[PDB]
mmCIF file of C-alpha atoms and ligand atoms in Angstrom:
data_model
loop_
_atom_site.group_PDB
_atom_site.id
_atom_site.type_symbol
_atom_site.label_atom_id
_atom_site.label_comp_id
_atom_site.label_asym_id
_atom_site.label_seq_id
_atom_site.Cartn_x
_atom_site.Cartn_y
_atom_site.Cartn_z
ATOM 1 C CA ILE E 1 0.201 -0.130 0.062
ATOM 2 C CA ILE E 2 1.409 3.285 -0.797
ATOM 3 C CA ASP E 3 1.167 6.589 1.049
ATOM 4 C CA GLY E 4 -1.358 4.853 3.749
ATOM 5 C CA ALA E 5 -1.349 4.174 7.222
ATOM 6 C CA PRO E 6 -1.368 0.996 9.585
ATOM 7 C CA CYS E 7 -4.888 -0.162 9.750
ATOM 8 C CA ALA E 8 -6.381 0.172 13.419
ATOM 9 C CA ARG E 9 -6.088 -3.266 14.866
ATOM 10 C CA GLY E 10 -8.737 -5.739 14.646
ATOM 11 C CA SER E 11 -10.585 -3.669 11.960
ATOM 12 C CA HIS E 12 -9.774 -6.219 9.077
ATOM 13 C CA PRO E 13 -10.736 -9.923 10.318
ATOM 14 C CA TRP E 14 -11.601 -11.080 7.061
ATOM 15 C CA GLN E 15 -8.097 -9.911 5.592
ATOM 16 C CA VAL E 16 -5.921 -12.787 5.006
ATOM 17 C CA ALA E 17 -2.527 -13.273 3.422
ATOM 18 C CA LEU E 18 -1.266 -15.872 0.813
ATOM 19 C CA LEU E 19 2.357 -16.977 1.910
ATOM 20 C CA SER E 20 5.096 -18.857 0.413
ATOM 21 C CA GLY E 21 6.376 -20.452 3.224
ATOM 22 C CA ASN E 22 7.093 -17.298 5.492
ATOM 23 C CA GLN E 23 7.047 -14.554 2.505
ATOM 24 C CA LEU E 24 4.023 -12.567 1.773
ATOM 25 C CA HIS E 25 2.770 -13.336 -1.728
ATOM 26 C CA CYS E 26 -0.485 -11.852 -2.144
ATOM 27 C CA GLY E 27 -3.359 -10.643 -0.127
ATOM 28 C CA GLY E 28 -6.810 -12.103 0.101
ATOM 29 C CA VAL E 29 -10.594 -12.263 1.885
ATOM 30 C CA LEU E 30 -12.072 -15.139 3.920
ATOM 31 C CA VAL E 31 -15.584 -15.897 2.247
ATOM 32 C CA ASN E 32 -16.090 -18.865 4.857
ATOM 33 C CA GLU E 33 -14.687 -21.402 6.945
ATOM 34 C CA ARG E 34 -13.108 -22.917 3.782
ATOM 35 C CA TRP E 35 -12.933 -20.383 1.174
ATOM 36 C CA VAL E 36 -10.231 -17.790 0.373
ATOM 37 C CA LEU E 37 -11.243 -15.140 -2.573
ATOM 38 C CA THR E 38 -8.195 -13.435 -4.009
ATOM 39 C CA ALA E 39 -6.554 -12.591 -7.352
ATOM 40 C CA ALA E 40 -6.200 -15.398 -10.101
ATOM 41 C CA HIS E 41 -2.718 -13.885 -10.989
ATOM 42 C CA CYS E 42 -1.759 -14.959 -7.509
ATOM 43 C CA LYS E 43 -2.066 -18.591 -7.956
ATOM 44 C CA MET E 44 0.409 -20.820 -6.444
ATOM 45 C CA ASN E 45 1.082 -24.592 -6.416
ATOM 46 C CA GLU E 46 0.349 -24.466 -2.772
ATOM 47 C CA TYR E 47 -0.406 -21.490 -0.210
ATOM 48 C CA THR E 48 0.398 -20.770 3.629
ATOM 49 C CA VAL E 49 -2.491 -18.685 4.735
ATOM 50 C CA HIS E 50 -2.501 -16.289 7.594
ATOM 51 C CA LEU E 51 -5.362 -15.256 9.629
ATOM 52 C CA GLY E 52 -5.995 -13.915 12.432
ATOM 53 C CA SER E 53 -3.182 -10.837 12.980
ATOM 54 C CA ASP E 54 -2.346 -7.432 11.281
ATOM 55 C CA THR E 55 0.865 -8.560 11.915
ATOM 56 C CA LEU E 56 2.534 -11.027 9.793
ATOM 57 C CA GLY E 57 4.441 -13.481 11.656
ATOM 58 C CA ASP E 58 2.211 -13.023 14.764
ATOM 59 C CA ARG E 59 2.431 -16.036 17.045
ATOM 60 C CA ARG E 60 -1.236 -16.088 17.828
ATOM 61 C CA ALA E 61 -1.722 -16.241 14.053
ATOM 62 C CA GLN E 62 -3.460 -18.922 12.338
ATOM 63 C CA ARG E 63 -1.596 -20.523 9.742
ATOM 64 C CA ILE E 64 -3.765 -22.943 7.254
ATOM 65 C CA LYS E 65 -2.345 -24.898 4.297
ATOM 66 C CA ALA E 66 -4.068 -24.583 0.669
ATOM 67 C CA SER E 67 -3.518 -26.956 -2.276
ATOM 68 C CA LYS E 68 -7.015 -26.197 -4.102
ATOM 69 C CA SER E 69 -7.085 -23.260 -6.221
ATOM 70 C CA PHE E 70 -9.766 -22.229 -8.735
ATOM 71 C CA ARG E 71 -9.608 -19.641 -10.896
ATOM 72 C CA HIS E 72 -12.394 -17.963 -13.069
ATOM 73 C CA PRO E 73 -12.742 -19.797 -16.149
ATOM 74 C CA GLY E 74 -12.340 -16.663 -18.041
ATOM 75 C CA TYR E 75 -9.220 -15.517 -16.160
ATOM 76 C CA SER E 76 -6.441 -14.203 -19.172
ATOM 77 C CA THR E 77 -2.689 -14.182 -18.270
ATOM 78 C CA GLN E 78 -2.588 -11.795 -21.548
ATOM 79 C CA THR E 79 -4.999 -9.204 -20.335
ATOM 80 C CA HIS E 80 -5.763 -10.093 -16.701
ATOM 81 C CA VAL E 81 -9.559 -9.609 -17.333
ATOM 82 C CA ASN E 82 -11.487 -11.535 -14.781
ATOM 83 C CA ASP E 83 -8.548 -11.622 -12.243
ATOM 84 C CA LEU E 84 -10.073 -13.527 -9.390
ATOM 85 C CA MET E 85 -9.728 -16.929 -7.905
ATOM 86 C CA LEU E 86 -11.149 -19.122 -4.510
ATOM 87 C CA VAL E 87 -8.531 -21.129 -2.848
ATOM 88 C CA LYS E 88 -9.792 -23.928 -0.622
ATOM 89 C CA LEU E 89 -8.542 -24.476 2.633
ATOM 90 C CA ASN E 90 -7.120 -28.039 3.515
ATOM 91 C CA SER E 91 -8.269 -27.584 6.868
ATOM 92 C CA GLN E 92 -11.371 -25.681 8.506
ATOM 93 C CA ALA E 93 -11.162 -21.891 9.452
ATOM 94 C CA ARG E 94 -11.539 -21.518 13.436
ATOM 95 C CA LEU E 95 -13.614 -18.250 13.562
ATOM 96 C CA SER E 96 -13.028 -16.018 16.324
ATOM 97 C CA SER E 97 -13.053 -11.847 17.197
ATOM 98 C CA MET E 98 -9.932 -11.718 15.029
ATOM 99 C CA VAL E 99 -11.219 -13.977 12.171
ATOM 100 C CA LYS E 100 -14.751 -13.493 10.401
ATOM 101 C CA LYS E 101 -16.529 -13.846 6.868
ATOM 102 C CA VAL E 102 -16.528 -10.787 4.548
ATOM 103 C CA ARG E 103 -19.762 -9.276 3.522
ATOM 104 C CA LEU E 104 -20.056 -10.127 -0.078
ATOM 105 C CA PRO E 105 -21.698 -7.109 -2.042
ATOM 106 C CA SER E 106 -25.226 -7.360 -3.268
ATOM 107 C CA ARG E 107 -24.843 -4.454 -5.725
ATOM 108 C CA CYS E 108 -21.918 -2.317 -7.391
ATOM 109 C CA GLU E 109 -21.212 0.914 -5.407
ATOM 110 C CA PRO E 110 -21.352 3.892 -7.442
ATOM 111 C CA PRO E 111 -18.272 6.144 -8.658
ATOM 112 C CA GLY E 112 -17.268 8.346 -6.229
ATOM 113 C CA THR E 113 -17.786 6.341 -3.200
ATOM 114 C CA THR E 114 -15.088 6.382 -0.738
ATOM 115 C CA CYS E 115 -13.469 3.032 -0.080
ATOM 116 C CA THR E 116 -10.636 1.235 1.770
ATOM 117 C CA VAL E 117 -7.860 -0.802 0.379
ATOM 118 C CA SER E 118 -5.503 -2.911 2.618
ATOM 119 C CA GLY E 119 -2.683 -5.305 2.387
ATOM 120 C CA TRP E 120 1.077 -6.193 3.270
ATOM 121 C CA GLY E 121 2.377 -5.163 0.098
ATOM 122 C CA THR E 122 5.262 -2.894 -0.459
ATOM 123 C CA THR E 123 4.970 0.829 0.866
ATOM 124 C CA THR E 124 7.669 1.919 -1.444
ATOM 125 C CA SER E 125 8.262 1.551 -5.285
ATOM 126 C CA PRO E 126 10.323 1.089 -7.257
ATOM 127 C CA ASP E 127 12.472 0.049 -4.444
ATOM 128 C CA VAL E 128 10.366 -2.479 -2.244
ATOM 129 C CA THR E 129 9.627 -2.309 1.310
ATOM 130 C CA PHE E 130 7.574 -4.845 3.097
ATOM 131 C CA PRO E 131 5.850 -3.929 6.219
ATOM 132 C CA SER E 132 4.840 -6.522 9.032
ATOM 133 C CA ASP E 133 1.779 -4.498 10.300
ATOM 134 C CA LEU E 134 -1.490 -4.556 7.935
ATOM 135 C CA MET E 135 -1.506 -0.861 6.067
ATOM 136 C CA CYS E 136 -4.603 0.839 5.008
ATOM 137 C CA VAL E 137 -5.464 3.572 2.694
ATOM 138 C CA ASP E 138 -8.725 5.721 1.290
ATOM 139 C CA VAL E 139 -9.564 5.993 -2.321
ATOM 140 C CA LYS E 140 -12.618 6.763 -4.557
ATOM 141 C CA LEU E 141 -14.024 4.633 -7.058
ATOM 142 C CA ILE E 142 -13.310 6.220 -10.493
ATOM 143 C CA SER E 143 -16.245 5.868 -13.380
ATOM 144 C CA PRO E 144 -15.292 3.315 -16.296
ATOM 145 C CA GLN E 145 -15.442 6.229 -18.731
ATOM 146 C CA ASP E 146 -12.981 8.399 -16.719
ATOM 147 C CA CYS E 147 -10.629 5.446 -16.327
ATOM 148 C CA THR E 148 -10.574 4.295 -19.987
ATOM 149 C CA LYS E 149 -9.100 7.826 -20.411
ATOM 150 C CA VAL E 150 -6.142 7.008 -18.551
ATOM 151 C CA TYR E 151 -5.777 3.334 -19.336
ATOM 152 C CA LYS E 152 -7.582 3.051 -22.986
ATOM 153 C CA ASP E 153 -6.955 -0.655 -24.114
ATOM 154 C CA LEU E 154 -5.707 -2.080 -20.981
ATOM 155 C CA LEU E 155 -9.310 -2.074 -19.477
ATOM 156 C CA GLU E 156 -11.291 -5.266 -19.979
ATOM 157 C CA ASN E 157 -14.951 -5.740 -18.324
ATOM 158 C CA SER E 158 -15.566 -5.958 -14.940
ATOM 159 C CA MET E 159 -12.460 -3.670 -14.081
ATOM 160 C CA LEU E 160 -13.227 -1.045 -11.332
ATOM 161 C CA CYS E 161 -10.728 1.739 -10.794
ATOM 162 C CA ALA E 162 -10.226 3.608 -7.799
ATOM 163 C CA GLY E 163 -7.684 6.310 -6.296
ATOM 164 C CA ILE E 164 -7.281 9.926 -5.341
ATOM 165 C CA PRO E 165 -6.614 12.792 -7.789
ATOM 166 C CA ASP E 166 -3.257 13.857 -7.993
ATOM 167 C CA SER E 167 -2.214 11.505 -5.260
ATOM 168 C CA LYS E 168 0.088 8.508 -4.576
ATOM 169 C CA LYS E 169 -2.412 6.909 -2.593
ATOM 170 C CA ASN E 170 -2.685 3.099 -4.243
ATOM 171 C CA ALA E 171 -1.903 -0.566 -3.869
ATOM 172 C CA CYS E 172 1.056 -2.231 -5.262
ATOM 173 C CA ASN E 173 3.376 -5.478 -5.680
ATOM 174 C CA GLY E 174 1.930 -7.962 -2.620
ATOM 175 C CA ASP E 175 -1.623 -6.154 -2.280
ATOM 176 C CA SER E 176 -3.267 -8.415 -4.938
ATOM 177 C CA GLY E 177 -6.232 -10.467 -3.901
ATOM 178 C CA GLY E 178 -6.602 -7.870 -1.002
ATOM 179 C CA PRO E 179 -10.169 -5.973 -0.133
ATOM 180 C CA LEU E 180 -11.430 -2.878 -1.361
ATOM 181 C CA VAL E 181 -14.362 -1.920 0.839
ATOM 182 C CA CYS E 182 -16.985 0.402 0.814
ATOM 183 C CA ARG E 183 -19.819 0.664 3.094
ATOM 184 C CA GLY E 184 -18.719 -2.561 4.901
ATOM 185 C CA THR E 185 -19.240 -4.504 1.784
ATOM 186 C CA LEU E 186 -16.407 -5.809 -0.570
ATOM 187 C CA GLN E 187 -16.434 -4.051 -3.671
ATOM 188 C CA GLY E 188 -13.014 -4.991 -5.089
ATOM 189 C CA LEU E 189 -9.838 -7.341 -4.982
ATOM 190 C CA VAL E 190 -6.381 -5.507 -5.808
ATOM 191 C CA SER E 191 -5.840 -6.592 -9.458
ATOM 192 C CA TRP E 192 -3.324 -4.478 -10.844
ATOM 193 C CA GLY E 193 -1.890 -0.856 -11.864
ATOM 194 C CA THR E 194 1.226 0.662 -13.106
ATOM 195 C CA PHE E 195 5.037 0.572 -12.284
ATOM 196 C CA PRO E 196 6.595 2.169 -10.274
ATOM 197 C CA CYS E 197 3.290 2.127 -7.897
ATOM 198 C CA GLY E 198 1.763 5.666 -7.073
ATOM 199 C CA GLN E 199 2.010 7.341 -9.852
ATOM 200 C CA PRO E 200 -0.580 10.105 -9.260
ATOM 201 C CA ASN E 201 -3.473 10.195 -11.404
ATOM 202 C CA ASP E 202 -2.666 6.561 -12.506
ATOM 203 C CA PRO E 203 -5.574 4.476 -10.775
ATOM 204 C CA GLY E 204 -5.353 1.168 -9.108
ATOM 205 C CA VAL E 205 -7.593 -1.280 -10.844
ATOM 206 C CA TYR E 206 -9.522 -3.742 -8.923
ATOM 207 C CA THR E 207 -11.715 -6.851 -9.934
ATOM 208 C CA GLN E 208 -15.472 -5.622 -9.569
ATOM 209 C CA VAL E 209 -16.690 -8.342 -7.267
ATOM 210 C CA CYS E 210 -20.354 -7.246 -7.709
ATOM 211 C CA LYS E 211 -20.140 -8.700 -11.113
ATOM 212 C CA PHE E 212 -18.802 -12.247 -10.101
ATOM 213 C CA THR E 213 -21.386 -12.740 -7.125
ATOM 214 C CA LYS E 214 -22.838 -15.519 -9.027
ATOM 215 C CA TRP E 215 -19.807 -17.263 -9.968
ATOM 216 C CA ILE E 216 -18.516 -17.145 -6.295
ATOM 217 C CA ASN E 217 -21.523 -18.819 -5.143
ATOM 218 C CA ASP E 218 -21.786 -21.573 -7.640
ATOM 219 C CA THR E 219 -18.077 -22.339 -7.538
ATOM 220 C CA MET E 220 -18.329 -22.610 -3.668
ATOM 221 C CA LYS E 221 -21.530 -24.711 -4.191
ATOM 222 C CA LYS E 222 -20.182 -27.236 -6.604
ATOM 223 C CA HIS E 223 -16.589 -27.959 -4.844
ATOM 224 C CA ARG E 224 -17.663 -29.267 -1.618
HETATM 225 C C1 LIG W 1 -0.568 -9.102 -8.173
HETATM 226 C C2 LIG W 1 -0.749 -7.954 -7.373
HETATM 227 O O1 LIG W 1 0.300 -8.124 -6.362
HETATM 228 C C3 LIG W 1 0.025 -6.884 -7.852
HETATM 229 C C4 LIG W 1 -0.572 -5.664 -7.153
HETATM 230 C C5 LIG W 1 -0.261 -4.102 -8.254
HETATM 231 C C6 LIG W 1 -1.207 -3.426 -8.151
HETATM 232 C C7 LIG W 1 -0.800 -2.229 -8.573
HETATM 233 C C8 LIG W 1 0.359 -1.883 -9.108
HETATM 234 C C9 LIG W 1 1.300 -2.615 -9.094
HETATM 235 C C10 LIG W 1 0.812 -3.751 -8.683
HETATM 236 N N1 LIG W 1 -0.598 -6.612 -9.552
HETATM 237 C C11 LIG W 1 0.348 -7.256 -10.529
HETATM 238 O O2 LIG W 1 1.501 -7.568 -10.209
HETATM 239 C C12 LIG W 1 -0.122 -7.196 -11.820
HETATM 240 C C13 LIG W 1 -0.627 -8.442 -12.213
HETATM 241 C C14 LIG W 1 0.944 -8.646 -13.124
HETATM 242 C C15 LIG W 1 0.905 -7.377 -13.943
HETATM 243 N N2 LIG W 1 0.514 -6.324 -13.150
HETATM 244 C C16 LIG W 1 0.893 -5.228 -12.933
HETATM 245 O O3 LIG W 1 -0.116 -4.401 -12.140
HETATM 246 C C17 LIG W 1 1.771 -4.523 -14.104
HETATM 247 C C18 LIG W 1 2.970 -3.500 -13.324
HETATM 248 N N3 LIG W 1 1.007 -3.660 -14.812
HETATM 249 C C19 LIG W 1 0.988 -3.700 -16.071
HETATM 250 O O4 LIG W 1 1.490 -4.484 -16.829
HETATM 251 C C20 LIG W 1 -0.226 -2.477 -16.605
HETATM 252 C C21 LIG W 1 -1.295 -3.163 -17.375
HETATM 253 N N4 LIG W 1 0.649 -1.689 -17.736
HETATM 254 C C22 LIG W 1 1.761 -1.087 -17.395
HETATM 255 O O5 LIG W 1 2.154 -0.748 -16.250
HETATM 256 C C23 LIG W 1 2.029 -0.073 -18.601
HETATM 257 C C24 LIG W 1 3.262 -0.880 -19.470
HETATM 258 C C25 LIG W 1 2.916 -0.844 -20.973
HETATM 259 O O6 LIG W 1 2.210 0.287 -21.373
HETATM 260 O O7 LIG W 1 2.961 -1.400 -21.648
HETATM 261 CU CU1 LIG W 2 5.763 -13.878 -4.035
HETATM 262 CU CU1 LIG W 3 0.484 -9.015 -17.654
#
């Protein structure tokens, strides 16, 4: 997260992290006791999912193994359209005051809405710096028309932009799959942006969750 601040402790119990052993790879959100929703480009052959703490490496944190991942059938490794994926938890996820289900959206929030994006991604760019504490930053949803003026052909269907005008406030490497929340509901998953991160007027791009609600449910309904 660029130009953000440490999230208030316990304000993100549905936030999870995908680790390659001990190193952060991506972020994600807990859908239920066995499902994590993250970015499709965050795919791994095996994951070590962090849950229950704002600090990576917390001794109290939960670390569950994952070997099954289900990317949206329409994901493109060339355009990154449909950048979302569900990862099945090998073991049950023990809920608590620090681990809760995320609230999926029932509709698409409109442009101009102020939202919060969070992650343990790099806080600097081009040079990389990874924080142990979960970082948060507020951004505003940008209309598809406005964003197309910036990215043109790079924008495909269900790609939601968010950012602050003339501001470095944005997501970056390691933040993918992480939640973009507005009004208590999940509106987006960090997908992509420009490099280096935090270029003013260069919006962060998110997978627009309100467009995949049916897919998310059916996929969890079919695989256990
Ligand atoms: C996977 C996730 O952690 C990461 C998060 C992120 C978000 C914003 C900025 C940087 C990183 N997302 C990515 O790494 C995604 C998926 C791989 C490609 N990617 C990018 O964000 C890259 C840096 N962006 C691009 O390639 C975009 C589409 N174009 C440009 O940067 C312009 C280059 C050109 O014109 O060819
Ligand atoms: Cu990695
Ligand atoms: Cu690419």
